[PDB]
Amino acid sequence: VWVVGMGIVMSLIVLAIVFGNVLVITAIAKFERLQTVTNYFITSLACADLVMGLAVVPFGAAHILTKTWTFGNFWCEFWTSIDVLCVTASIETLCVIAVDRYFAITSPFKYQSLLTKNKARVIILMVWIVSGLTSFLPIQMHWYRATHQEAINCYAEETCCDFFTNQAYAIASSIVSFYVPLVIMVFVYSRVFQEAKRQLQKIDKSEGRHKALKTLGIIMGTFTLCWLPFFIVNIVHVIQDNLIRKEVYILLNWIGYVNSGFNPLIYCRSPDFRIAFQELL
Numbered sequence: 001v002w003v004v005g006m007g008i009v010m011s012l013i014v015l016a017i018v019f020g021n022v023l024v025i026t027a028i029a030k031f032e033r034l035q036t037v038t039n040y041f042i043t044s045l046a047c048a049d050l051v052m053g054l055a056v057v058p059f060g061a062a063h064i065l066t067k068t069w070t071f072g073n074f075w076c077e078f079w080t081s082i083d084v085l086c087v088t089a090s091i092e093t094l095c096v097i098a099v100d101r102y103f104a105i106t107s108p109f110k111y112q113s114l115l116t117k118n119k120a121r122v123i124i125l126m127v128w129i130v131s132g133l134t135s136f137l138p139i140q141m142h143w144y145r146a147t148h149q150e151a152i153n154c155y156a157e158e159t160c161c162d163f164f165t166n167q168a169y170a171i172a173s174s175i176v177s178f179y180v181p182l183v184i185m186v187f188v189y190s191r192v193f194q195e196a197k198r199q200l201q202k203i204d205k206s207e208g209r210h211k212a213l214k215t216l217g218i219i220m221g222t223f224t225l226c227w228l229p230f231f232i233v234n235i236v237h238v239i240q241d242n243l244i245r246k247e248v249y250i251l252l253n254w255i256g257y258v259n260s261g262f263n264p265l266i267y268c269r270s271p272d273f274r275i276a277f278q279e280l281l
């Protein structure tokens with residue numbers, strides 16, 4: 001009375017993610033007026049979200065609904081690697097976009113000199129490579145493997161897939177993937193807000209006879225509310241093994257997945273994108 005209908009939500013999420021990401025990619029690729037150095041970061045972010053929505057989500061949905069993993073252990077390890085890869089790549093691309101905006105507003109004359117067409121490709125490749133070294137290299141060689149008896153029983157059996165991780169791997173991965181980008185983005189947006197307030201005050205002083213707050217609020221709040229509650233419990237549940245159950249962890253992780261769907265509605269609402277979308281349909 002629950003399974004026969006609760007798959008509708010997963011189907012809707014999959015459809016929304018795939019449609020939004022493919023529409024953004026098609027709009028950027030097809031029309032030449034959208035070709036910009038800043039738009040390449042959005043292209044990489046959309047590609048990461050598309051891969052996530054095409055691979056990670058359906059298999060997880062099958063895992064919860066069926067409650068068994070029909071496929072082998074090799075596919076389980078591959079799925080975990082893809083999950084970690086996509087998550088960290090997306091979160092790092094967000095910080096890259098924020099730093100680009102910081103450089104755009106803070107230093108207006110030499111914005112062009114710092115970043116060109118060729119440098120963006122190198123930045124994106126380095127971001128994806130650092131993302132890859134976090135997931136595939138440790139998982140495939142079995143560095144994260146736990147040691148307690150329940151983990152051994154889960155790992156030996158070929159029909160169960162429960163994520164058991166070492167303390168050191170969890171801490172290092174969380175620090176590399178979330179907290180450093182969080183700090184960088186906070187500092188960047190604080191400086192940007194200060195500059196905007198100064199300019200607004202200058203204009204009001206010039207023309208003798210509030211708006212950036214909402215713009216910063218959407219971007220900060222969406223990311224923080226979507227990805228902060230997951231990493232708190234991720235860090236906590238390794239130090240103490242009795243506080244956090246195995247269902248709240250899954251619920252928070254799936255809450256974090258939805259953040260891929262909201263990215264096109266935040267970073268791709270410019271008017272030129274509106275003309276591009278209107279022309280397509």
Ligand SMILES: CN[C@@H]1CCc2c(ccc(O)c2O)[C@H]1O
Nearest residue numbers: 083084087163170173174177253
């Ligand atoms: C199966 N879910 C995984 C488990 C742990 C983990 C995730 C995402 C980013 C990380 O850095 C992680 O360590 C989650 O998506």
